[PDB]
Amino acid sequence: MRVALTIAGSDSGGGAGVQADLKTFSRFGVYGMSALTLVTAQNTLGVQRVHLLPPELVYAQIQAVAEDLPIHAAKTGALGNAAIVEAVAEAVRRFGIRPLVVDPVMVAKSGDPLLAPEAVAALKERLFPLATLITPNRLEAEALLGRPIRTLEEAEEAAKALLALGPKAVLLKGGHLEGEEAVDLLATGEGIRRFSAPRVQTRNTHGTGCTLSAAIAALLALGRPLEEAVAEAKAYLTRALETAPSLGHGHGPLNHFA
Amino acid sequence: MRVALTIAGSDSGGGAGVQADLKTFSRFGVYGMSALTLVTAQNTLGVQRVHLLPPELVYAQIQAVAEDLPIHAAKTGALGNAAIVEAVAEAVRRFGIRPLVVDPVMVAKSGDPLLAPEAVAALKERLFPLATLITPNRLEAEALLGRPIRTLEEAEEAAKALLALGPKAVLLKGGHLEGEEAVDLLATGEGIRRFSAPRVQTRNTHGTGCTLSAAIAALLALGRPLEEAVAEAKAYLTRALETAPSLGHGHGPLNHFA
């Protein structure tokens, strides 16, 4: 049985965070492990309480699981602050946790910042070099690079520029839109590839970022090639959006059984 | 889609706690929600760090999920201390969280105490009356009652005595052993029923307590009758033990996909 680890926050409503990560691992048959960075009281209407865990507790959880159990792939999610980010990178390096899918979690899809600038600098300097893959959204890539991303040419050049920060691969989610489709740009040293996806119109959009990166890491734990992993993960996210339960009053969760 | 809530601790290794609870919910098709009581660094060799969350954060998570999402069933697990126990019962009562499967989590299967005596008194006085079902193991029932449980007659009388504490039903796990089988005693006001299960001999026994109660709550969320729910949950735990992965160096996790 293959194993995947998530290093992310806790969503009490179960649509995002470690909850969405573990539910995705079970959907793909991967054994799921989790190192909690923070705890939130949260529902479909949004967060109500956020409690960041001590950086040493986040390190201890990674040290306890890695010393005892195989880690065939892993992903990181919300990391809270610069201190937790530095502790996560120090564990990932010491224990050799590869493949690692680092989801930036610095700017929300709504445009709300999720990470302090000191935490963003630690995320670029410490965690990015360890990442086999990063998955910024378009606004997050503009913050990391300091440059606008407005055309398909600018998106391709942006995804290549992010490789300079360290990651072996960059998936620029939503870097170009064309009508009712959305285009992701996968950049490696080999070149650039495009991934189409239909633009669903729904309230049930909670946890889309967590779920995608977790599905990529789960497929990587199964040994699938990176291009096939990101392609199969996007199809699952499209089905999870199309068949999502109408739970909650706000941004509803995805259907992880899809 | 039916929904179930767990109110329990976090096991970084993924074999027990909220991780085992959510993995069980996905196995039965139930949408999973979680209110964290505490965070642990843990693997198959045991716990290394335990961080109890503020009682108000545990209350806030329950308040946020219950105000927004349906709860067709729920279970409680590790509760840390008396203050967290009182906060959990106050939320469960205010929000009407029924059916509720309260797993005592006061004495480990190894005999190690898991809860302070002040927390045990709060668990009996505050949380037990709200429970539709409690699932003590034999040592836990001896601590709750103050009486030895050594014969099948003593086990049946013990399971009936626990109904005096408030729960609508009592499942006395392992209250009598006979050869290579283990007998659970389900007591309600209707009477007593017996549930056989083979005694597996394996290292992969981690999370057996969490997994069973979570499967009962998941089946209750699906609308199954209590007797059929506890019976089908035991068959799943037997298959999960028989087909468990040989992960880790110590008490290994169950196979939740079984």
Side-chain angles (χ1 to χ4, degrees), chain A residues 145-158:
Chain A
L145 287 181
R147 300 142 41 167
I149 299 165
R150 303 157 300 189
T151 69
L152 176 57
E153 296 195 354
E154 287 185 338
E156 286 176 321
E157 220 58 31

Side-chain angles (χ1 to χ4, degrees), chain A residues 3-7 31-36 57-74 91 95 97, chain B residues 10-15 19 40-46 48 247-249:
Chain A
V3 191
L5 163 70
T6 183
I7 307 170
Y31 184 84
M33 296 188 301
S34 63
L36 273 304
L57 176 62
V58 189
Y59 188 97
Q61 298 170 72
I62 305 170
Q63 176 164 14
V65 306
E67 281 180 345
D68 177 42
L69 295 143
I71 306 170
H72 301 108
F95 296 113
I97 302 184
Chain B
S10 178
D11 173 13
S12 58
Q19 288 73 10
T40 74
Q42 188 182 169
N43 58 26
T44 62
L45 284 310
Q48 299 175 3
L247 294 167
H249 302 71

Side-chain angles (χ1 to χ4, degrees), chain B residues 94-110:
Chain B
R94 172 190 178 187
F95 296 113
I97 302 184
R98 319 266 315 185
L100 176 64
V101 178
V102 169
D103 196 8
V105 192
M106 44 184 299
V107 184
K109 288 82 174 57
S110 60

Side-chain angles (χ1 to χ4, degrees), chain B residues 87-214:
Chain B
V88 168
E90 181 54 39
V92 165
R93 173 173 181 274
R94 172 190 178 187
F95 296 113
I97 302 184
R98 319 266 315 185
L100 176 64
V101 178
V102 169
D103 196 8
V105 192
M106 44 184 299
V107 184
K109 288 82 174 57
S110 60
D112 294 300
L114 306 180
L115 230 49
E118 304 180 346
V120 175
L123 167 69
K124 300 157 63 178
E125 159 186 349
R126 311 288 185 97
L127 190 51
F128 272 20
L130 306 169
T132 75
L133 174 69
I134 59 164
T135 57
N137 63 49
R138 191 174 58 183
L139 283 174
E140 288 170 342
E142 289 181 333
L144 294 164
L145 287 181
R147 300 142 41 167
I149 299 165
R150 303 157 300 189
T151 69
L152 176 57
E153 296 195 354
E154 287 185 338
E156 286 176 321
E157 220 58 31
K160 302 210 302 284
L162 290 167
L163 292 170
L165 265 49
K168 280 175 161 295
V170 178
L171 180 69
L172 213 176
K173 305 179 308 173
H176 177 78
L177 307 185
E178 195 156 2
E180 224 61 54
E181 300 289 312
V183 183
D184 297 0
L185 284 313
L186 182 62
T188 77
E190 182 191 9
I192 293 200
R193 194 191 194 287
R194 295 170 188 174
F195 292 89
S196 187
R199 298 177 68 199
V200 190
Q201 171 194 340
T202 176
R203 45 180 283 269
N204 303 311
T205 54
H206 189 39
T208 46
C210 318
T211 295
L212 179 66
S213 39

Side-chain angles (χ1 to χ4, degrees), chain A residues 222-247:
Chain A
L222 300 177
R224 272 159 168 87
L226 170 69
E227 288 191 25
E228 307 180 354
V230 296
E232 190 175 351
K234 287 187 64 66
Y236 165 70
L237 182 71
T238 293
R239 302 195 309 276
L241 282 150
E242 293 288 345
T243 66
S246 281
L247 294 167

Side-chain angles (χ1 to χ4, degrees), chain A residues 13 19 31 34 43-44 64 68 249, chain B residues 13 31 34 43-44 64 68 249:
Chain A
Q19 288 73 10
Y31 184 84
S34 63
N43 58 26
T44 62
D68 177 42
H249 302 71
Chain B
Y31 184 84
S34 63
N43 58 26
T44 62
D68 177 42
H249 302 71

Side-chain angles (χ1 to χ4, degrees), chain A residues 1 3 10-15 19 22-23 25-26 29-34 36 39-45 48-49 51 53-54 57 60-61 64-65 67-70 245 247-250 253-255 257, chain B residues 1 3 10-15 19 22-23 25-26 29-34 36 39-45 48-49 51 53-54 57 60-61 64-65 67-70 245 247-250 253-255 257:
Chain A
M1 190 175 291
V3 191
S10 178
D11 173 13
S12 58
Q19 288 73 10
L22 291 173
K23 288 174 186 180
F25 296 160
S26 289
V30 179
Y31 184 84
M33 296 188 301
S34 63
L36 273 304
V39 184
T40 74
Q42 188 182 169
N43 58 26
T44 62
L45 284 310
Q48 299 175 3
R49 299 275 189 277
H51 175 96
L53 294 175
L57 176 62
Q61 298 170 72
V65 306
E67 281 180 345
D68 177 42
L69 295 143
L247 294 167
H249 302 71
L254 307 170
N255 175 23
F257 302 107
Chain B
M1 190 175 291
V3 191
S10 178
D11 173 13
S12 58
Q19 288 73 10
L22 291 173
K23 288 174 186 180
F25 296 160
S26 289
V30 179
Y31 184 84
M33 296 188 301
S34 63
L36 273 304
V39 184
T40 74
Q42 188 182 169
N43 58 26
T44 62
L45 284 310
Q48 299 175 3
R49 299 275 189 277
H51 175 96
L53 294 175
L57 176 62
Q61 298 170 72
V65 306
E67 281 180 345
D68 177 42
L69 295 143
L247 294 167
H249 302 71
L254 307 170
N255 175 23
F257 302 107

